[PDB]
Design a protein around this ligand. Structure first.
Ligand SMILES: Nc1ncnc2c1ncn2[C@@H]1O[C@H](COP(=O)(O)OP(=O)(O)O)[C@@H](O)[C@H]1O
Lengths: 270, 275, 370
């Protein structure tokens, strides 16, 4: 059954990432014994939650959730209301409020839409956060699309010197639909994950969350540019290489260029 | 406890919609998942039939020296498929890679003879579009109507590279004098799975009206329609996405902010907005 | 008509020219058209009123300098025609355009309309017998004597990392930016105004290029240089007045690695180099890492190659042998390769003849290049 989990993860890596929720539910139907293993291991699109007391949307993960209920980052309360939920420390809660506010301004500048959520769970040696974002594209347009963040960070605070070992694990779950130009409609689904670790000295001017943020900004600019290329580097060579009309006239030229390069090869040496 | 009938339906959805580079692996993944073989092996055999028809993939029959695509138009109905070029029936085994034990077929083929001249032409143009290209031009009567059904594909699979590009083309040409009617769908699929996944999924539905004149003309007219459509398609598929995806993917999330300055974290944590 | 062919290596900053089968380009001069600002009162003044090359360099202060070509894309076509006419004229080459075949160069992945209009100029206005446009990276490898390897380059207009493996220039793996020496010179000019010493004039713009060429260095750790206070070194201008440069000298060439500082989204030189290696096939990546060739003027900063090596070590997979090689004459790397390519007997087959252009048109030029 360890091979079954390996196959289950291999299957979700090959099926469309647009239908993770439906396929994961069916995969749990087919293997009910792996339900707990698959829900933890298989990454899926983030759920929308609504805080009724504040009147604001928050996002749901395994880390912020304790049992059936999920701590809202705005009110600090779980829905449904649990008696003794796993809350953070009063210092970490104040830090968590400042994280939410900081990453609220983060998202709103990069996307200018959607919803985010930030939750920080208390550790003895550190403070570890999750930064969720979900932005939806223009619904009226034929081109649908969304962008989803799952930045999990682990900060190991050192005792002396005020330095902090950060460990960022960032997933980016994308699905671009393209229905335009009167030539057909294409739907592209991406899912790259990148890891980054760093030790930064703590400043009194800028808190530790700002140090975390700097990793997110740099990671997102790089992951995005990496993603961007893995799209083209494959959608270009593979599709063009299959059905290129200019392949057959250039093949005759390449064969001429093969004689030519061979003549160049001898002449370059001497 | 999930019922045995529920297990087969879950297996069917994955096998019916699997990426063709790894679909035979997906079947192996479904089989390596559920313990017993017979329940999936029996259910997959039906799925493979429907699945291998929608791929337009050719099984090489041992002694033909060419590749005959398989579809709904070649389906005789008795688990054997037509090869309209070489004009022999073949039984296609769906688990195993090969199709063997063929049977010579003989039909009057009056509608079928006309299109086989147009077919042998199409091939030469398929060879022009792709480095490796295989086809099948089915000849059939559909509820009294007279219809050529050319199909083209391309399979480019490599295990080490982790990328797989696959083309399938569906083309139906109904013969009616003078004016004829055409219906065709054109699907691309590419999949990259290194350090995480990326998929290209596509199609173009085209409705066209053609007029029959000569055998040389009808052979070179339909091909011309395909040539221009598939180029315009690839052109748009390559040239729009390299630029427009970059801008639409950017319209969702921008590479830098509206200021074009990396956001200052010190600014965020000690500034107030509004009124 | 197979005379000794001419190699006009184009470029936004500098334009090289000369004959085939030569060691160095004899005719190098900056690619711009100087025109007189002031009113010519006195008789017996500078005649012509359109200055190109060494006359324009000699008489900077009179002339309002303007560049015809930005980011490997000509804006003013009349200016480039005058430059090409000056190249062929008696003041530089001492030849006719009708005699010799032409080898042109351009940056990769440019607009095709500019390539067509370039060919129109060579075939119609000049009466060229045969034309051939080529890549810069392909030539630079022919100059060195290798076939395999990536070519990172940095001129005044374009920075592009082209991977090649045994005479197979992958058109798809070519990365490119519109960020280069001109943008670094513009960013240094902006920093000098923040320091105090403002330069706004077009003749005065070339003093900023001269300061950028001479007094600049790329630090390995930029955060460490930001924390430390600079020494504020001096430099004498063409006039005589001294200028304390300050922290502008080291923060100016950071634009190439951090493109966010000017205010435009791009990858960067070090990212582009990693990105060109990644887009190619898995088996060819380790050979591409081992052979990395440098070229252009904006690779000549102090500690540039050392910073590139550190950036590759950070991004690339671990336990891989990195080697960023470079020639002695980095400025004339592309032209030497063209002179070698032109001297070869194969060159006759590749070119676009004037008869072939008159028959077909632009389609034949698009086919022969790729
Ligand atoms: N020693 C140097 N240090 C820094 N920058 C230089 C140096 N020499 C030249 N440059 C810059 O590089 C440019 C010349 O590059 P070049 O490769 O000739 O451009 P192109 O590729 O367009 O011909 C000049 O415009 C100048 O700004």
């Amino acid at each position: 059954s360890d091979q079954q989990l390996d196959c289950a993860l291999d299957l979700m890596r090959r099926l469309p990432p647009q239908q993770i929720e439906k396929n994961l539910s069916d995969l749990i139907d087919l293997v009910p014994s792996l339900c707990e293993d698959l829900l933890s291991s298989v990454d899926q699109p983030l759920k929308i939650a609504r805080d009724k007391v504040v009147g604001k949307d928050y996002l749901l993960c395994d880390y912020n959730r304790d049992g059936d209920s999920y701590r809202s980052p705005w009110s600090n309360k779980y829905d449904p209301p649990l008696e003794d939920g796993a809350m953070p420390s009063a210092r970490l809660r104040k830090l968590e409020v400042e994280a939410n506010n900081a990453f609220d301004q983060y998202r709103d500048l990069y996307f200018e839409g959607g919803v985010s959520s930030v939750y920080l769970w208390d550790l003895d040696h550190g403070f570890a956060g999750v930064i969720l974002i979900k932005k939806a594209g223009d619904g009226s347009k034929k081109i649908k699309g969304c962008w989803d963040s799952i930045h999990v960070v682990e900060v190991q605070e050192k005792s002396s010197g005020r330095t902090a070992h950060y460990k960022l694990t960032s997933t980016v779950m994308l699905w671009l639909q393209t229905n335009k130009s009167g030539s057909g409609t294409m739907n592209l689904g991406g899912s790259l994950t990148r890891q980054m670790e760093k030790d930064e000295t703590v400043s009194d001017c800028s808190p530790h969350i700002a140090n975390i943020g700097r990793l997110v900004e740099d990671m997102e600019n790089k992951i995005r540019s990496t993603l961007n290329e893995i799209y083209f580097g494959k959608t270009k060579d593979i599709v063009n290489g299959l059905r290129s009309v200019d392949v057959i006239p250039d093949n005759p030229k390449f064969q001429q260029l093969q004689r030519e390069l061979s003549q160049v090869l001898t002449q370059r040496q001497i | 406890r999930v019922s045995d009938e529920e297990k087969v339906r879950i297996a069917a959805k994955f096998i019916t919609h699997a990426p063709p580079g790894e679909f035979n692996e997906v079947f192996n993944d479904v089989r390596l998942l559920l313990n017993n073989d017979n329940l999936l092996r029996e259910g997959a055999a039906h799925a493979f039939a429907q699945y291998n028809m929608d791929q337009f993939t050719p099984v090489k029959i041992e002694g033909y020296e060419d590749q005959v695509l398989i579809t709904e138009h070649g389906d005789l109905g008795n688990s054997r498929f037509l090869d309209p070029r070489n004009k022999i029936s073949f039984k296609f085994d769906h688990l195993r890679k090969e199709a063997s034990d063929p049977q010579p077929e003989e039909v009057d083929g009056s509608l079928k003879s006309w299109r086989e001249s147009c077919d042998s032409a199409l091939r030469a143009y398929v060879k022009d579009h792709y480095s490796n290209g295989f086809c099948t031009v089915y000849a059939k009567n559909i509820d009294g109507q007279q219809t050529i059904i050319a199909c083209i594909e391309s399979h480019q699979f490599q295990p080490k590279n982790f990328w797989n590009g696959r083309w399938r083309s569906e083309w139906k040409f109904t013969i009616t004098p003078p004016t004829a009617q055409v219906v065709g769908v054109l699907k691309i699929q590419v999949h990259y799975y290194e350090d995480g996944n990326v998929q290209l999924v596509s199609h173009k539905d085209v409705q066209d009206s053609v007029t029959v004149s000569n055998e040389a003309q009808t052979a070179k007219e339909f091909i011309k329609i395909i040539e221009h459509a598939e180029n315009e398609y690839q052109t748009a598929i390559s040239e729009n996405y390299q630029t427009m995806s970059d801008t639409t993917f950017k319209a969702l999330r921008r590479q830098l902010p509206v200021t074009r300055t990396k956001i200052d974290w010190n600014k965020i944590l000690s500034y107030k907005i509004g009124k | 008509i197979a005379n000794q062919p001419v190699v006009i290596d184009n470029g936004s900053g500098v334009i090289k020219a000369g004959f085939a089968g030569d060691q160095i380009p004899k005719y190098c001069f900056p690619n711009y058209v100087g025109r007189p600002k002031h009113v010519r009162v006195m008789a017996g003044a500078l005649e012509g009123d359109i200055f190109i090359g060494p006359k324009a360099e000699e008489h900077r202060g009179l002339l309002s300098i303007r560049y015809p070509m930005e980011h490997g894309i000509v804006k003013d076509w009349n200016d480039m025609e005058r430059i090409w006419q000056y190249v062929y004229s008696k003041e530089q080459l001492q030849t006719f355009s009708e005699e010799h075949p032409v080898l042109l160069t351009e940056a990769p992945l440019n607009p095709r309309k500019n390539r067509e209009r370039a060919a129109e100029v060579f075939f119609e206005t000049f009466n060229v017998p045969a034309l051939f446009i080529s890549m810069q990276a392909v030539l630079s490898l022919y100059a060195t004597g290798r076939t395999t390897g990536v070519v990172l380059d940095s001129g005044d207009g374009v920075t592009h990392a082209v991977p090649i493996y045994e005479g197979f220039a992958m058109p798809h793996s070519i990365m490119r930016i519109d960020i280069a020496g001109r943008d670094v010179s513009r960013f240094l000019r902006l920093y000098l105004r923040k320091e105090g010493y403002d330069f706004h004039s077009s003749s005065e713009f070339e003093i900023v290029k001269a300061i950028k060429e001479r007094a600049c260095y790329l630090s390995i750790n930029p955060q460490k240089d930001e924390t430390l206070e600079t020494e504020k070194a001096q430099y004498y201008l063409p006039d005589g007045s001294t200028i304390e440069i300050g922290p502008s000298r080291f923060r100016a060439p950071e634009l190439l690695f951090r493109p966010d500082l000017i205010g435009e989204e791009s990858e960067g030189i070090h990212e582009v180099l990693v990105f060109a290696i990644q887009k190619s096939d898995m088996d060819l990546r380790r050979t591409l890492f081992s052979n990395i060739v440098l070229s252009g003027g904006s690779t000549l900063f102090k500690g540039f190659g050392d910073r590139l090596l550190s950036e590759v070590k950070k991004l690339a997979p671990k336990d891989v042998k990195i080697r960023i090689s470079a020639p002695q004459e980095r400025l004339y790397s592309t032209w030497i390769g063209g002179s070698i390519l032109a001297s070869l007997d194969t060159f006759k087959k590749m070119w676009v003849s004037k008869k072939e252009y008159e028959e077909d048109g632009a389609r034949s030029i698009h086919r022969k290049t790729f």
